[PDB]
Design an enzyme around this catalytic site. Structure first.
Site, short mmCIF file in Angstrom:
data_model
loop_
_atom_site.label_atom_id
_atom_site.label_comp_id
_atom_site.label_asym_id
_atom_site.label_seq_id
_atom_site.Cartn_x
_atom_site.Cartn_y
_atom_site.Cartn_z
N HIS A 129 -8.77 -3.24 1.71
CA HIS A 129 -9.24 -2.56 0.51
C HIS A 129 -9.56 -3.53 -0.64
CE1 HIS A 129 -4.84 -2.77 0.12
NE2 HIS A 129 -5.07 -2.88 -1.17
N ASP A 184 -8.47 -6.89 -1.29
CA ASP A 184 -7.54 -7.94 -1.72
C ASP A 184 -6.82 -8.58 -0.50
OD1 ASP A 184 -5.27 -5.44 -3.15
OD2 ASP A 184 -5.35 -6.28 -1.11
N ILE A 204 4.04 -1.18 5.88
CA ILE A 204 3.90 -1.38 4.46
C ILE A 204 3.38 -0.09 3.79
CG2 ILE A 204 1.58 -2.45 4.71
CD1 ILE A 204 2.20 -4.02 2.18
N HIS A 259 -0.87 -0.68 -5.77
CA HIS A 259 -1.69 -0.08 -4.74
C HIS A 259 -0.81 0.62 -3.71
CE1 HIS A 259 -5.10 -3.30 -5.35
NE2 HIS A 259 -4.89 -2.56 -6.43
N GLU A 271 -0.12 6.73 4.29
CA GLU A 271 1.15 7.43 4.19
C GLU A 271 0.90 8.85 3.71
OE1 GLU A 271 2.96 5.48 5.56
OE2 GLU A 271 1.97 3.59 4.94
N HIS A 287 9.83 1.28 -7.42
CA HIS A 287 9.91 -0.02 -6.79
C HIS A 287 8.67 -0.86 -7.14
CE1 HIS A 287 11.19 -2.77 -3.46
NE2 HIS A 287 9.90 -3.02 -3.43
N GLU A 288 7.49 -0.30 -6.97
CA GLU A 288 6.25 -1.02 -7.22
C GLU A 288 6.10 -1.41 -8.68
OE1 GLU A 288 5.90 -1.71 -3.85
OE2 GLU A 288 3.84 -1.97 -4.60
N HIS A 317 7.91 -4.49 -9.40
CA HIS A 317 7.06 -5.66 -9.12
C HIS A 317 5.98 -5.88 -10.18
CE1 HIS A 317 8.89 -6.53 -5.29
NE2 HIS A 317 8.37 -5.50 -4.65
N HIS A 370 12.90 -8.87 -5.23
CA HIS A 370 13.81 -8.04 -4.48
C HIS A 370 15.26 -8.31 -4.78
CE1 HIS A 370 10.49 -7.03 -1.40
NE2 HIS A 370 10.55 -6.14 -2.37
N1 LIG Z 1 10.88 -0.18 6.94
C1 LIG Z 1 10.99 0.83 6.09
O1 LIG Z 1 12.08 1.33 5.74
C2 LIG Z 1 9.69 1.37 5.57
C3 LIG Z 1 9.05 2.18 6.68
C4 LIG Z 1 7.99 3.09 6.20
C5 LIG Z 1 7.64 4.13 7.23
O2 LIG Z 1 7.74 3.82 8.44
O3 LIG Z 1 7.25 5.25 6.83
N2 LIG Z 1 8.81 0.29 5.14
C6 LIG Z 1 9.18 -0.54 4.18
O4 LIG Z 1 10.23 -0.40 3.55
C7 LIG Z 1 8.25 -1.70 3.90
C8 LIG Z 1 8.59 -2.91 4.78
C9 LIG Z 1 7.49 -3.95 4.77
C10 LIG Z 1 7.79 -5.18 5.62
O5 LIG Z 1 8.58 -6.03 5.17
O6 LIG Z 1 7.21 -5.30 6.72
N3 LIG Z 1 8.24 -2.10 2.50
C11 LIG Z 1 7.28 -1.70 1.60
O7 LIG Z 1 6.49 -0.94 2.00
C12 LIG Z 1 7.41 -2.30 0.33
C13 LIG Z 1 7.01 -1.21 -0.71
C14 LIG Z 1 8.09 -0.26 -1.07
C15 LIG Z 1 9.39 -0.34 -1.03
C16 LIG Z 1 9.90 0.88 -1.61
C17 LIG Z 1 11.30 1.27 -1.83
C18 LIG Z 1 12.27 0.35 -1.65
C19 LIG Z 1 13.64 0.73 -1.88
C20 LIG Z 1 13.95 2.00 -2.28
C21 LIG Z 1 15.36 2.36 -2.54
C22 LIG Z 1 15.70 3.42 -3.48
C23 LIG Z 1 16.96 3.74 -3.81
C24 LIG Z 1 18.01 3.00 -3.18
C25 LIG Z 1 17.70 2.05 -2.32
CL1 LIG Z 1 18.90 1.09 -1.64
C26 LIG Z 1 16.36 1.66 -1.98
C27 LIG Z 1 12.86 2.97 -2.51
C28 LIG Z 1 11.56 2.62 -2.31
N4 LIG Z 1 8.91 1.56 -2.04
O8 LIG Z 1 7.84 0.86 -1.72
C29 LIG Z 1 6.39 -3.49 0.26
P1 LIG Z 1 6.55 -4.52 -1.23
O9 LIG Z 1 8.10 -4.83 -1.38
O10 LIG Z 1 5.94 -3.89 -2.52
C30 LIG Z 1 5.70 -6.06 -0.79
C31 LIG Z 1 6.39 -7.25 -0.80
C32 LIG Z 1 5.69 -8.47 -0.55
C33 LIG Z 1 4.41 -8.47 -0.25
BR1 LIG Z 1 3.86 -10.32 -0.06
C34 LIG Z 1 3.65 -7.18 -0.17
C35 LIG Z 1 4.28 -6.00 -0.48
CA LIG Z 2 1.26 1.68 5.88
CA LIG Z 3 -2.25 10.24 2.65
ZN LIG Z 4 -4.13 -3.91 -2.63
ZN LIG Z 5 9.13 -4.82 -2.90
#
Ligand SMILES: NC(=O)[C@H](CCC(=O)O)NC(=O)[C@H](CCC(=O)O)NC(=O)[C@H](Cc1cc(-c2ccc(-c3cccc(Cl)c3)cc2)no1)CP(=O)(O)c1ccc(Br)cc1
Ligand SMILES: [Ca+2]
Ligand SMILES: [Ca+2]
Ligand SMILES: [Zn+2]
Ligand SMILES: [Zn+2]
Ligand SMILES: [Ca+2]
Length: 159
Positions: free
Chosen positions: A64, A66, A76, A92, A97, A114-115, A118, A124
């Site tokens: 998209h 970037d 993600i 973004h 989802e 969370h976003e 950032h 983190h």
């Molecule tokens: N693994 C999971 O639990 C879910 C799964 C999603 C699904 O399957 O539907 N995915 C995730 O959590 C993924 C994992 C990504 C990865 O490392 O590969 N994370 C992401 O997608 C990150 C984005 C994201 C994280 C959250 C979040 C995190 C914590 C909590 C929460 C709330 C209350 C208490 C507690 Cl303990 C936790 C709520 C929302 N909300 O969005 C990506 P990003 O950190 O913005 C990032 C970092 C670096 C770059 Br470079 C780019 C972007």
């Molecule tokens: Ca995704």
């Molecule tokens: Ca959607």
């Molecule tokens: Zn983007």
């Molecule tokens: Zn994050």
């Protein structure tokens, strides 16, 4: 540490809306997510519809324009740029989802908290109860609170 905004009045604009939720629920989730952070810092956030906002909120798909291509459903959920000009600050959300007000799908409010962390310059947390912990978890949004670690982190950047 990271870059920080060098001002305490920050605007945001919602570039576009996910069809997963109605407009007013998207607006509400985002407004409340900003309020979480304004509640513990000197920062103030205003939504604008016209003008040059600091933080643009975008829903987009896959590659998209970037260096953080999305990956379809799951994986993600979103990514955000740290403070700076232009794309700096922008948040973004992956349209592949299913964004919700609740516990089904991916909760927009919690992801936005969370976003926006950032977008304000936080990284983190190692605290497994912190909203800045790396991995998404649903928690009751009606009783949601920042952890002491989140508050420490943001107060170390602003104020
Ligand atoms: N693994 C999971 O639990 C879910 C799964 C999603 C699904 O399957 O539907 N995915 C995730 O959590 C993924 C994992 C990504 C990865 O490392 O590969 N994370 C992401 O997608 C990150 C984005 C994201 C994280 C959250 C979040 C995190 C914590 C909590 C929460 C709330 C209350 C208490 C507690 Cl303990 C936790 C709520 C929302 N909300 O969005 C990506 P990003 O950190 O913005 C990032 C970092 C670096 C770059 Br470079 C780019 C972007
Ligand atoms: Ca995704
Ligand atoms: Ca959607
Ligand atoms: Zn983007
Ligand atoms: Zn994050
Ligand atoms: Ca920006």
């Amino acid at each position: 540490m990271g870059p920080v905004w060098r001002k305490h009045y920050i605007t945001y604009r919602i570039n576009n809306y996910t069809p997963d939720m109605n407009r007013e629920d998207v607006d509400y989730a985002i407004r409340k997510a900003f309020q979480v952070w304004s509640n513990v810092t000197p920062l103030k956030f205003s939504k604008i519809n016209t003008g040059m906002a600091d933080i643009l909120v975008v829903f987009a798909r896959g590659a998209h324009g970037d260096d953080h291509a999305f990956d379809g459903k799951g994986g993600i959920l979103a990514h955000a740029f740290g403070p700076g000009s232009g794309i700096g600050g922008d948040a973004h959300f992956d349209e592949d989802e299913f964004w919700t007000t609740h516990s089904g799908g991916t909760n927009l409010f919690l992801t936005a908290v969370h976003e926006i962390g950032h977008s304000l310059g936080l990284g983190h947390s190692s605290d497994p109860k912190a909203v800045m912990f790396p991995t998404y978890k649903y928690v009751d949004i009606n009783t949601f609170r920042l952890s002491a670690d989140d508050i420490r982190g943001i107060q170390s950047l602003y104020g």
